[PDB]
């Protein structure tokens, strides 16, 4: 609600970034192999920005990726809910 | 509400475009370095079109980018609210 769905998204974005590097390392080609850009990749994902920066190529990386979308889009289908309500009320008064 | 979340998005899209050029200049490679396409980049972002046109490569550019998504997606999770309500009412009557 308040800052609750917020926090859960950040669990997703870290645990996602972490496991993505674990899944993709060992697959000849993956660019998703350092914890920095692994984290930035999980934001593009949760937010559906699809910038085309990075993406997984292993099966298990795609699985991690799906979890981020689901758990991210849900969070972000709620984090923006919070911001929207909060700031429309504040700016309107 | 009316044209309120609208205006805030345009603050985001300008201040975003501006700061993106400031962040990315100096990083050997960034295409996000003139104020025109810096502005168009912040629309692709707020709207999640992920066309793959431009994107940041510095850390600080990615930060600016996140702020655009959050403050944009929120606005745009509300600007389309406005249009939807407004025009469904008008067209229905």
């Amino acid at each position, epitope marked *: 609600a308040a800052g609750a769905a917020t926090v859960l998204l950040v669990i997703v974005l870290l645990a996602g970034s972490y496991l993505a590097v674990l899944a993709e390392r*060992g697959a000849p080609g993956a660019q998703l192999i350092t914890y920095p850009r692994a984290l930035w990749w999980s934001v593009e994902t949760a937010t559906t920005v699809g910038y085309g920066d990075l993406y997984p190529v292993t099966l298990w990386g795609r699985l991690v990726a799906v979890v981020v979308m689901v758990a991210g889009i849900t969070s972000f289908g709620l984090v923006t809910a919070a911001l929207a309500t909060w700031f429309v009320g504040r700016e309107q008064e | 509400a009316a044209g309120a979340a609208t205006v805030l998005l345009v603050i985001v899209l300008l201040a975003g475009s501006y700061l993106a050029v400031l962040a990315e200049r100096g990083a050997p490679g960034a295409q996000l370095i003139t104020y025109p396409r810096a502005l168009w980049w912040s629309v692709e972002t707020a709207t999640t079109v992920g066309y793959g046109d431009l994107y940041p490569v510095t850390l600080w550019g990615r930060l600016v980018a996140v702020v655009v998504m959050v403050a944009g997606i929120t606005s745009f999770g509300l600007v389309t609210a406005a249009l939807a309500t407004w025009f469904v009412g008008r067209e229905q009557e």
Partner: antibody
Amino acid sequence: VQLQQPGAELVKPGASVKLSCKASGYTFTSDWIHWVKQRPGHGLEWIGEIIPSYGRANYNEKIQKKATLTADKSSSTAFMQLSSLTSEDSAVYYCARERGDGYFAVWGAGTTVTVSS
Amino acid sequence: DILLTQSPAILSVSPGERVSFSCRASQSIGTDIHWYQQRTNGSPRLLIKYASESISGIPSRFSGSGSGTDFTLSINSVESEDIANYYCQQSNRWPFTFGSGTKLEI
């Protein structure tokens, strides 16, 4: 001395050998340990990486995969097992400390392996 | 497997002068190159990370340049303590790879 590995080894041809790497300093969850091989008068040959905490390892596709990586989580020491060697396999063997960001900040002293009877 | 290609192999130069080892990738890797120095008998030693950023404890002589597929280690001056082999190593795509290496002669 951050990454600390033995001085020299001798292996009968066809025999196996284990290689150690004790790492004082930090011991981060996210640390990776790599192993690079330097044949005499050559360049650096990345062999394989291991993340000790979580436990998975990945080896170099291209080379004859003679080796296998392990670690001891609560001793801060990691291992590489080279199985059945020739004299093509005589070289210096470093371990490196990649933080997870993609470069080998910390290097071991190297272990000289000489495969001979 | 990305191919780093350091030309030339050896690099003659007179002391105090600027010097530049090119490294040229086999496809774009952005800025994910890193440079290493390895003198005679000693282990390698990180010089420049992420193609430009410096390392705390490295002489300011070393200057990281380049992006894409053209990269350049530069030493603004040269002194005798700088004779070594110099290696590059990409982190953009798995596996991490190394260059063939360049030795510096004076």
